[PDB]
């Protein structure tokens, strides 16, 4: 509702809009793929987090080395049973602990389910996914993912600077 979550909501939409853009669907104006609000300089934190979010945004499973096909086949949802799916999503997302992995997983999966969900639920479904994504991530994930690092692991993934000065830097003094 109000805890510093503007850039987070604009980021998820940037990527989600990029995948959906191939089909031509956007809640902002049927076209955007950036933010349409944040308006960052793209070279200090927004370019670093955006570029790192993309690089790891496909490393969620890493060459598909975890499970089988389950992001397009069947796909069940409706106004009365979807509530069970959402409750399961967060509950299962708390398995090992809500971290930066939850963002990479919802990136590809959220776009792979959204393309089939919007086409099976009109443009009203995805329009909710954008708001619910912020309400859920802000409900109990913003402080959690950030408490463990979250964005810190993302930038270290695309930057490969995890073994430079981050290991012995924020593990004794900070």
């Amino acid at each position: 509702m109000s805890a510093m979550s503007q850039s987070n909501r604009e980021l998820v939409v940037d990527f989600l809009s990029y995948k959906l853009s191939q089909k031509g669907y956007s809640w902002s104006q049927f076209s955007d793929v950036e933010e349409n609000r944040t308006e960052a300089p793209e070279g200090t934190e927004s370019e670093a987090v955006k570029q790192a979010l993309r690089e790891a945004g496909d490393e969620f499973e890493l060459r598909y080395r975890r499970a089988f096909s389950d992001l397009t086949s069947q796909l069940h949802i409706t106004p009365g049973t979807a509530y069970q799916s959402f409750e399961q999503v967060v509950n299962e997302l708390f398995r090992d602990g809500v971290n930066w992995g939850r963002i990479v997983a919802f990136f590809s999966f959220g776009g792979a389910l959204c393309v089939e969900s919007v086409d099976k639920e009109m443009q009203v479904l995805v329009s909710r996914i954008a708001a619910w994504m912020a309400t859920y991530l802000n409900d109990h994930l913003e402080p959690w993912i950030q408490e463990n690092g979250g964005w810190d692991t993302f930038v270290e993934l695309y930057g490969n600077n995890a073994a430079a000065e981050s290991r012995k830097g924020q593990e004794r003094l900070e």
């Binding site: 975890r66 509530y83 399961q88 708390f94």
Partner: peptide, 25 residues
């Protein structure tokens, strides 16, 4: 109810569980 929700949460957390690796998968 949502019987397919089993994968909507489990398969979602599955790949996301890679976070435990801490960048180093």
């Amino acid at each position: 109810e949502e019987q397919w929700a089993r994968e909507i949460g489990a398969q979602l957390r599955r790949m996301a569980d890679d976070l435990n690796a801490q960048y180093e998968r």
